Design a protein around this ligand. Structure first.
Ligand SMILES: [Mg+2]
Ligand SMILES: [Mg+2]
Ligand SMILES: [Mg+2]
Ligand SMILES: [Mg+2]
Ligand SMILES: [Mg+2]
Ligand SMILES: [Mg+2]
Ligand SMILES: [Mg+2]
Ligand SMILES: [Mg+2]
Ligand SMILES: [Mg+2]
Ligand SMILES: [Mg+2]
Ligand SMILES: [Mg+2]
Ligand SMILES: [Mg+2]
Ligand SMILES: [Mg+2]
Ligand SMILES: [Mg+2]
Ligand SMILES: [Mg+2]
Ligand SMILES: [Mg+2]
Ligand SMILES: [Mg+2]
Ligand SMILES: [Mg+2]
Ligand SMILES: [Mg+2]
Ligand SMILES: [Mg+2]
Ligand SMILES: [Mg+2]
Ligand SMILES: [Mg+2]
Ligand SMILES: [Mg+2]
Ligand SMILES: [Mg+2]
Ligand SMILES: [Mg+2]
Ligand SMILES: [Mg+2]
Ligand SMILES: [Mg+2]
Ligand SMILES: [Mg+2]
Ligand SMILES: [Mg+2]
Ligand SMILES: [Mg+2]
Ligand SMILES: [Mg+2]
Ligand SMILES: [Mg+2]
Ligand SMILES: [Mg+2]
Ligand SMILES: [Mg+2]
Ligand SMILES: [Mg+2]
Ligand SMILES: [Mg+2]
Ligand SMILES: [Mg+2]
Ligand SMILES: [Mg+2]
Ligand SMILES: [Mg+2]
Ligand SMILES: [Mg+2]
Ligand SMILES: [Mg+2]
Ligand SMILES: [Mg+2]
Ligand SMILES: [Mg+2]
Ligand SMILES: [Mg+2]
Ligand SMILES: [Mg+2]
Ligand SMILES: [Mg+2]
Ligand SMILES: [Mg+2]
Ligand SMILES: [Mg+2]
Ligand SMILES: [Mg+2]
Ligand SMILES: [Mg+2]
Ligand SMILES: [Mg+2]
Ligand SMILES: [Mg+2]
Ligand SMILES: [Mg+2]
Ligand SMILES: [Mg+2]
Ligand SMILES: [Mg+2]
Ligand SMILES: [Mg+2]
Ligand SMILES: [Mg+2]
Ligand SMILES: [Mg+2]
Ligand SMILES: [Mg+2]
Ligand SMILES: [Mg+2]
Ligand SMILES: [Mg+2]
Ligand SMILES: [Mg+2]
Ligand SMILES: [Mg+2]
Ligand SMILES: [Mg+2]
Ligand SMILES: [Mg+2]
Ligand SMILES: [Mg+2]
Ligand SMILES: [Mg+2]
Ligand SMILES: [Mg+2]
Ligand SMILES: [Mg+2]
Ligand SMILES: [Mg+2]
Ligand SMILES: [Mg+2]
Ligand SMILES: [Mg+2]
Ligand SMILES: [Mg+2]
Ligand SMILES: [Mg+2]
Ligand SMILES: [Mg+2]
Ligand SMILES: [Mg+2]
Ligand SMILES: [Mg+2]
Ligand SMILES: [Mg+2]
Ligand SMILES: [Mg+2]
Ligand SMILES: [Mg+2]
Ligand SMILES: [Mg+2]
Ligand SMILES: [Mg+2]
Ligand SMILES: [Mg+2]
Ligand SMILES: [Mg+2]
Ligand SMILES: [Mg+2]
Ligand SMILES: [Mg+2]
Ligand SMILES: [Zn+2]
Lengths: 126, 119, 146, 50, 87
RNA sequence: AAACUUUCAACAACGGAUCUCUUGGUUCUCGCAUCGAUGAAGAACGCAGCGAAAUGCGAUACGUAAUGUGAAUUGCAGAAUUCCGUGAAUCAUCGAAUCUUUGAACGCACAUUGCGCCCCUUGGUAUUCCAGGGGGCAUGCCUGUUUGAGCGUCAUUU
RNA sequence: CGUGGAGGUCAGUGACGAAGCCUAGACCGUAAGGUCGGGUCGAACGGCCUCUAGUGCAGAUCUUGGUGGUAGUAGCAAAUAUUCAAAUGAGAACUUUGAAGACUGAAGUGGGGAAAGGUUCCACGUCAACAGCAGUUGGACGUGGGUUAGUCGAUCCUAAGA
RNA sequence: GUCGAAUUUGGGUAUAGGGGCGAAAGACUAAUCGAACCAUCUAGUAGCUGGUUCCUGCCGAAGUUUCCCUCAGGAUAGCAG
RNA sequence: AUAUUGGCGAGAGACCGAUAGCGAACAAGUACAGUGAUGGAAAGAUGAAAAGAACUUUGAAAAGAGAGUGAAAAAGUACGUGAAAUUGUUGAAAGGGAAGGGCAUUUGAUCAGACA
RNA sequence: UUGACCUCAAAUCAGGUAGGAGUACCCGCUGAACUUAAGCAUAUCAAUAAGCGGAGGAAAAGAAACCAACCGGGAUUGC
């Protein structure tokens, strides 16, 4: 259990801190786990999802589908995959909204910084 | 697009001055266009640029004055530390630490002695 | 408003007493804060022991005089028979009291002997720099019982 | 009225500006809650008390 | 005639707007505000008036300045600017 | 016999109980000491590409600078050069600024966007009139500076 | 006996349907109540030993909310008054235009102002609500336009007074 | 009724609550007047009026004694568990 | 060492659960009232996702009827569940100046259990 | 004539300070009545509410013109 005096087990406080979290904080909550491949590749279990990454839906009814993240919708706590959409009745397609904890990262998108993140978590990077 | 601050700080006092008129002339014209087109988001950028210039002109005219006052009594009130009205008038460390001549000889001759109880 | 056979109570709640109720909900809180207080101080205070040497003293009136109890400070006389001045004894952790007088030799000697044993059982580090680390005893009251 | 102080006209102007309905694009925003304008005012219904 | 027909004569304001609080409590002939006490240097309020108090206290406003004083205190009233590390 | 009234049921009304929710409230405890003439608290009016409000801000106006993060914002449009980068962002932080008309509110007033004075400057052929730009002038009190007043009063002239 | 919550326990019930609600269907208890079926429903909940209380309603001209009978009832009756046609429109007793009949009778139902309102002005669009019948009409609704001063007011002056 | 004046009336201004104003009615003082309105003291006190929420089981009254500015109430004894 | 229904920051509860809890869980000290001092509400819940109903047909329109979406429209921005008073329909039954109730039985309807 | 002195002035004289806010807690002033007494004035409510002045992170108090009467104790604050 919590041993620190600055942690709060309070449920009402957690749920406030989630929904009222600023854009910067949602970035890290919106982490997705690396694929078993990419994990032993990079020596790292999970990373905050970013836009042009590549991803496989491992949960839900889009289970098995893959694509490129078209946008991180931080406001909505949802990530959108280009290639995963609803065809509507009038035929106009519309994005589905996915949660990064139900995705898996199959290809990263690397930066000077995106690399340094992997290095700051203590893992190899091919 | 839009003006960058670190790039303004290298421009001359009169260079930035003419940038500002150029931006104003720019912004003045855009407002004519805005009432024909049914949106003009480019205008937000040029009015932010003006703001960004005026800051820089101000920043430099201030650090000019701040240094040619630097190090002396009586510099203008808006270059003095803001702090708090009370902190402002709190005794300086010098007239706090001040100690009576008789008091000083006593601190010297009988300071609090470090000691301990065992043997 | 008077009936049966009952003691006559005197319960003074005719003012606005609910305004002035004090429930000590902070008992546990303030005990911790007092323990932390003492801890933080024992650290700031170097090997010095949190408390000062206190004299033997005979407790007043007819009811308590049979018992002897710790006083405030040591009476410039008793300080002087133990061979140190007031000013220095204060820096040494001995409490001095200019107001207390000695009408009684037996107590007078007890406090001089108390001062003697204390002087022997302490070490006073040099003014210089060295501070030869000595491991604080926290009491004086416990080391020098009355 | 019909000869007014500028302070009176100024307030009078700000109340003209506040007299529109809910701009309908707000209705579409994420978590949008406001439905209509509930501060809407009419000249023969509620009086401005200056 | 003390009712509806006499109400038909009410066209003259007793109070206009108050410069200080803008409440329409500013008594014209008395030249003082029944709400905030202006022109009086001090501000009208009473301890029998708890709601009236809660309506106007500090915090019902923008606190344009007092807003930031506690953060500025948190940082020890930093005079200066922040330098750099990278990124 | 219907209709009508009444009772029960089913389905549909009306209405919003109930159950289950909870970014709110209440109460306790712990830590801390920071408003204002360096213009506070409060007020008014403004500010977005498309806003009435709420929140934010002040003609540099849902913000400017700085610092950290490291790609968003998102209702629509939008820019596109912002993506291995002095760099996205209704982000976080905040140390530099701006900060209208006011307010203890201070040139005088104020049911008035009313009315003076001084200084520097620019224009109108201008020390004097008009106009634009900038900077100023409340009160009590303290220390000090300077110009003074009084046969209150000392001396010094010839 | 029954409610909210608390300690323990039955490794209790449940998205293969918890709770709730409905049911002149069933069973247990003298009773407070308990139990089951069926329907509806959608995320939680109960038995037992104990703890605890903001713990059980028919009333209080009780509090708040909702709803009846009254009842398609009282009524929509002051200010003399309307009528024919055409146009428009899904729709015309009620809008527009033409015609007729009247009225206010310059102490006006006329032409402007002060106080007060504050956009009601004007145009275009337009009928869900509103104008106690109606509505294509409006002081309504939507979207826009409009208030130009050396001489008209303020501003200056003084009045009771402040 | 009166209608050229102790006339009517707008605006400005003064008078404020045990106070004002009153050609005097306790009238008027913002539908409020034999003491306005607002908040607070205040959940004022009430021997008085109204209400007081589940079941069953057993027992089961009093309206009388004495004292009380007591007589619509208490204390006291009695009856009751 | 002591105080603290204010302020800044924190950890909590055998607390309340939208008529409760602060008046305010919401554009709440708001809307609104009052000349003014002051007075001061109501108002949370579609769904995992708007997938917020393309298209056809009737209509002047609003809408209806199909269709479509959805795990479900017995979830349709009147939106979780959706009680009661009270209302429509349908079915059943009774009714000479109320209705309702107790004991008992006829008749109709309905139902448990128990035989083996 | 000139130069001091005392006291009193004026400056948009050089530099400063005060106001207002908040006010839970703190230091003062001022100050009720409802209420209780089964009535009521002294009393009570209460050295309370309302009103006024002034501080702080605590305020105030504090090194005895104290307590005591003992074999005496020994600033203040608080439990
Ligand atoms: Mg991480
Ligand atoms: Mg007591
Ligand atoms: Mg406490
Ligand atoms: Mg100690
Ligand atoms: Mg040293
Ligand atoms: Mg009207
Ligand atoms: Mg209003
Ligand atoms: Mg109002
Ligand atoms: Mg008046
Ligand atoms: Mg006055
Ligand atoms: Mg003033
Ligand atoms: Mg939920
Ligand atoms: Mg809580
Ligand atoms: Mg915004
Ligand atoms: Mg950088
Ligand atoms: Mg930001
Ligand atoms: Mg002034
Ligand atoms: Mg002005
Ligand atoms: Mg000027
Ligand atoms: Mg002087
Ligand atoms: Mg029980
Ligand atoms: Mg239940
Ligand atoms: Mg039934
Ligand atoms: Mg059964
Ligand atoms: Mg069920
Ligand atoms: Mg659910
Ligand atoms: Mg129990
Ligand atoms: Mg109760
Ligand atoms: Mg009831
Ligand atoms: Mg009843
Ligand atoms: Mg009853
Ligand atoms: Mg009722
Ligand atoms: Mg009808
Ligand atoms: Mg009729
Ligand atoms: Mg009639
Ligand atoms: Mg008629
Ligand atoms: Mg007609
Ligand atoms: Mg005629
Ligand atoms: Mg005539
Ligand atoms: Mg209609
Ligand atoms: Mg109307
Ligand atoms: Mg109508
Ligand atoms: Mg109609
Ligand atoms: Mg309009
Ligand atoms: Mg003129
Ligand atoms: Mg003028
Ligand atoms: Mg009175
Ligand atoms: Mg009186
Ligand atoms: Mg008086
Ligand atoms: Mg009234
Ligand atoms: Mg009246
Ligand atoms: Mg009561
Ligand atoms: Mg009462
Ligand atoms: Mg009686
Ligand atoms: Mg019996
Ligand atoms: Mg008597
Ligand atoms: Mg009786
Ligand atoms: Mg607290
Ligand atoms: Mg509520
Ligand atoms: Mg309750
Ligand atoms: Mg409420
Ligand atoms: Mg729900
Ligand atoms: Mg609901
Ligand atoms: Mg349909
Ligand atoms: Mg269908
Ligand atoms: Mg369902
Ligand atoms: Mg549903
Ligand atoms: Mg729909
Ligand atoms: Mg429903
Ligand atoms: Mg029966
Ligand atoms: Mg059977
Ligand atoms: Mg059977
Ligand atoms: Mg000066
Ligand atoms: Mg003050
Ligand atoms: Mg009382
Ligand atoms: Mg009494
Ligand atoms: Mg009494
Ligand atoms: Mg009495
Ligand atoms: Mg007293
Ligand atoms: Mg007294
Ligand atoms: Mg007080
Ligand atoms: Mg005060
Ligand atoms: Mg302070
Ligand atoms: Mg302390
Ligand atoms: Mg002394
Ligand atoms: Mg003592
Ligand atoms: Zn005011």
């Amino acid at each position: 259990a919590k041993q620190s005096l600055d942690v709060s087990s309070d449920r009402r406080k957690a749920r406030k801190a989630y929904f009222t979290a600023p854009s910067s904080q949602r970035r890290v909550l919106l982490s997705a786990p690396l694929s078993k491949e990419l994990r032993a590749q990079y020596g790292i279990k999970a990373l905050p999802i970013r836009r042009d990454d590549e991803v496989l839906v491992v949960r839900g009814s889009k289970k098995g589908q893959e694509g490129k993240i078209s946008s991180v919708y931080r406001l909505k706590f949802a990530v959108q995959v280009d290639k995963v959409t609803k065809e509507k009745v009038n035929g106009a397609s519309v994005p589905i909204n996915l949660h990064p904890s139900k995705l898996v990262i199959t290809k990263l998108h690397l930066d000077k910084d995106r690399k340094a993140l992997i290095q700051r978590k203590g893992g190899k990077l091919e | 697009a839009g003006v960058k601050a670190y790039e303004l700080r290298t421009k001359s006092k009169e260079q930035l001055a003419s940038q500002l008129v150029d931006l104003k002339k720019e912004l003045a014209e855009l407002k004519v266009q805005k009432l024909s087109r049914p949106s003009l988001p480019k205008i937000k950028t040029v009015r932010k640029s003006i703001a960004c210039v005026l800051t820089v002109i101000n920043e430099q005219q201030r650090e000019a004055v701040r240094q040619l006052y630097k190090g002396k009594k009586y510099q203008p009130k808006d270059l003095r530390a803001k702090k708090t009205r009370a902190l402002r008038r709190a005794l300086t460390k010098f007239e706090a630490s001040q100690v009576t001549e008789k008091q000083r000889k006593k601190q010297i001759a009988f300071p609090q002695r470090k000691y301990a109880i065992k043997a | 408003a008077i009936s049966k056979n009952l003691p006559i109570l005197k319960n003074h709640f005719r003012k606005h007493w609910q305004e002035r109720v004090k429930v000590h909900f902070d008992q546990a809180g303030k005990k911790v804060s007092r323990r932390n207080a003492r801890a933080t101080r024992a650290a700031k205070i170097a090997p010095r022991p949190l408390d000062l040497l206190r004299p033997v003293v005979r407790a007043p009136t007819v009811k308590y005089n049979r018992k002897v109890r710790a006083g405030r400070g040591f009476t410039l006389a008793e300080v002087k028979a133990a061979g140190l001045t007031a000013a220095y004894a204060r820096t040494i952790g001995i409490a001095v009291d200019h107001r207390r007088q000695n009408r009684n030799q037996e107590i007078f000697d007890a406090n001089v002997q108390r001062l003697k044993e204390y002087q022997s059982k302490i070490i006073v580090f040099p003014r210089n720099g060295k501070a030869p680390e000595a491991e604080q005893v926290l009491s004086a009251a416990a080391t020098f019982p009355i | 009225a019909a000869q007014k102080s500028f302070r009176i006209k100024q307030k009078m102007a700000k109340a003209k500006k506040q007299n529109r309905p809910l701009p309908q694009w707000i209705r579409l925003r994420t978590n949008n809650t406001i439905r209509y304008n509930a501060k809407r005012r009419n000249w023969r219904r509620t009086k401005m008390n200056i | 005639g003390k009712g509806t027909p006499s109400f038909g004569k009410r066209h003259n304001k007793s109070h206009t707007l108050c410069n200080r609080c803008g409440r329409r409590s500013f008594h014209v002939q008395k030249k003082t505000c029944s709400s905030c006490g202006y022109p009086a240097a001090k501000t009208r309020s009473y301890n029998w008036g708890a709601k009236a108090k809660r309506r106007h206290t500090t915090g019902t406003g923008r606190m344009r300045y007092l807003k930031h004083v506690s953060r500025r205190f948190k940082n020890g009233f930093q005079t200066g600017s922040a330098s750099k590390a990278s990124a």
